[PDB]
Design a protein around this ligand. Structure first.
Ligand SMILES: OC[C@H]1O[C@@H](S[C@@H]2[C@@H](O)[C@H](O)O[C@H](CO)[C@H]2O)[C@H](O)[C@@H](O)[C@@H]1O
Length: 603
């Protein structure tokens, strides 16, 4: 009697989309296009404004320490409001699950993308995508703002750790995260269509379109000083591979191409991504991306709305001032400035993702999935990934020396030292707990010190000293030392030291330690950093990047349970005065070339 085609799960997605679109008011349409922060959401807001999507920005959590069920209850409360509208269109909830479900207490934290590039293992990255989707679904969230497929062309960029590599081929290969997060696409799949397999997978997001990784100094306020190819060659290809793997959404960059803000760039968003690549999912803004079309940002929000929607963006991450957005856009459509065809295209795309992913069939969280969060099998995977990410840069001071690594697990006494030896926040880096990352024990995990204590023979005495002086080392009777130092957590605009030198004490600790006993230096960083003084001091040196919560991945290689296999995914500069300097540069003069890495064999 009361049949409604869009609510019929047996019907084809396109039919469901069209049936629903055809019923919607303009307010219902513009609501779909609006994404708001949970911090501004209430049930009445969500219902009254027919809101399409919610997000947690970095650090936007229901409480410090919240359990998976607490996250599920939050998301469900929001969903129940949305399902109570006239049409009952479920909202999609997005979050930066960029190295695991990293805003959430107790989530597995995977290595950041630069370390994953070092692994040269696209199947590992697929499996990480699979584990990440389960952990995101543990918390009731259906949508992850990953992968970042930036090709970072200058390591001074404060997001360079979110790029798999300066080499776009490695970036292309690591687009295998997408079918991990979303499921593998059907055999006969059409490139550009969105895909999510169902309730145990999440929608993905290739970001930030396009050229976010491009120069100038290093990348980071910009711009892309490059030209067409440049584009087509360096910054664009991985978006094609994302289309081939059915990425559901694409997020637009704050940056500009050829002097046109990407958030206003009709030629690339509509002409290229939609009309040439045949992208059929939805295009989302970045956070206040549209505001930033103007200078200063936010100084003509009317124009920001007009320019971004006519450029072809589908959903706007407002994320706070929803009233202004909805009002202005309504005014533009009522005025004829933005045609209903454009609104209908936006809403078609949003609904196509939602129907395709099963959201109308499973709008609510699965309580049985809660135990996926921090699940030990996922931690085992993260440990594998961290170990594979490590690049051995030095293993002996001279060609006559015994290799230091692998270290013996049995020794009378050993020293673990350095600012980064017992600091889980530093080992995870940015985008962890959140947004900027943080220091100390911010989540469940294993520091380098705890990993050493868990590895060594019971007879081995392990002594920790954060910053020991030279005498302490010389008098301790140590067999060897593991010293861990490096970068503090950061991002694009915060904590990003463009001299690329590690904070002190870091070098001074390595010098004090290595001056007294054979040492293995573990460098924790988002990128290559000035290294020669650390190399000169150290017997062995390992670039561990930002390995995440599973510090036993580091000890697994240090003590020879597995061999070192990681290879540099970036060029290691001799000097910052060289930069930018990437593989293929005219004057390519690296300290270590892209692909460099020493190996060991398992003991
Ligand atoms: O968290 C959602 C999106 O956020 C922006 S970064 C943004 C920053 O530009 C703004 O000034 O402040 C916000 C505070 O969290 C940041 O999210 C990021 O650029 C995206 O990668 C991300 O997915």
């Amino acid at each position: 009697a009361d049949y409604v085609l869009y609510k019929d799960a047996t019907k084809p997605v396109e039919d469901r989309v069209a049936d629903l679109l055809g019923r919607m008011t303009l307010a219902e349409k513009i609501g779909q296009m609006t994404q708001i922060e949970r911090l501004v959401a209430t049930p009445d807001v969500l219902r009254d404004n027919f809101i399409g999507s919610l997000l947690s920005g970095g650090g936007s959590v229901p409480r410090k320490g919240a359990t998976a069920k607490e996250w599920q209850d939050m998301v469900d409360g929001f969903q129940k409001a949305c399902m109570s509208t006239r049409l009952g269109i479920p909202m999609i909830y997005g979050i930066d699950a960029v190295h695991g479900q990293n805003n959430v207490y107790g989530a597995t934290i995977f290595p950041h993308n630069v370390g994953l590039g070092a692994t040269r293992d696209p199947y590992l990255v697929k499996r990480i995508g699979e584990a990440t989707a389960l952990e995101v679904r543990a918390t009731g969230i259906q949508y992850a703002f990953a992968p970042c497929i930036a090709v970072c062309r200058d390591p001074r960029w404060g997001r360079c750790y979110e790029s798999y590599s300066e080499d776009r081929r490695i970036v292309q290969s690591m687009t295998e995260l997408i079918p991990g997060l979303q499921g593998d696409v059907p055999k006969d799949f059409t490139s550009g269509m969105p895909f999510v397999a169902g309730k145990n997978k999440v929608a993905a997001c290739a970001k930030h379109f396009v050229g976010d990784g491009g120069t100038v100094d290093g990348i980071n306020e910009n711009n892309t000083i490059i030209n067409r190819e440049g584009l087509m060659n360096i910054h664009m290809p991985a978006y094609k591979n994302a289309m081939d793997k059915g990425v559901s959404t694409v997020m637009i960059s704050y940056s500009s191409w050829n002097g046109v803000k990407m958030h206003a760039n009709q030629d690339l968003v509509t002409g290229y991504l939609k009309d040439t690549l045949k992208f059929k999912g939805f295009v989302i803004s970045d956070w206040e991306g549209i505001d930033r079309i103007t200078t200063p940002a936010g100084s003509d929000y009317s124009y920001s709305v007009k320019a971004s929607i006519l450029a072809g963006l589908d959903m706007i991450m407002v994320p706070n001032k929803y009233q202004q957005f909805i009002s202005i856009l309504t005014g533009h459509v009522n005025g004829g400035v933005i045609p209903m065809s454009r609104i209908d295209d936006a809403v078609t795309r949003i609904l196509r993702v939602k129907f395709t992913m099963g959201l109308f069939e499973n709008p609510y969280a699965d309580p049985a999935m809660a135990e996926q969060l921090g699940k030990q099998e996922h931690r085992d995977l993260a440990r594998e990934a961290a170990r594979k990410s490590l690049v051995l840069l030095k293993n002996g001071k001279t060609s006559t020396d015994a290799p230091l690594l692998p270290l013996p697990k049995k020794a009378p006494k050993i020293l673990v030292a350095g600012s980064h030896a017992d600091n889980l926040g530093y080992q995870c880096g940015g985008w962890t707990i959140e947004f900027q990352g943080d220091t100390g024990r911010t989540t469940v995990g294993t520091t380098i010190l705890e990993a050493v204590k868990a590895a060594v023979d019971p007879s081995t005495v392990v002594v920790f000293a954060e910053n020991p002086d030279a005498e302490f080392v010389k008098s301790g009777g140590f067999s060897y030392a593991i010293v861990a130092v490096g970068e503090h957590p950061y991002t694009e605009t915060k904590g990003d030291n463009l001299n690329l030198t590690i904070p002190e004490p870091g070098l001074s600790t390595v010098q004090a330690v290595c001056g007294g006993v054979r040492c293995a230096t573990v460098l924790i960083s988002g990128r290559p950093v000035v290294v020669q003084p650390l190399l000169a001091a150290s017997d062995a040196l390992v670039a561990a990047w930002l390995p995440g919560s599973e510090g036993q991945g580091v000890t697994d290689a240090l003590f020879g349970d597995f061999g070192f296999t990681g290879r540099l995914p970036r060029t290691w500069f001799k000097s910052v005065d060289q930069l930018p300097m990437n593989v293929g540069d005219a004057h390519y003069d690296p300290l270590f070339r892209l692909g460099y890495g020493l190996t060991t064999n398992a003991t």
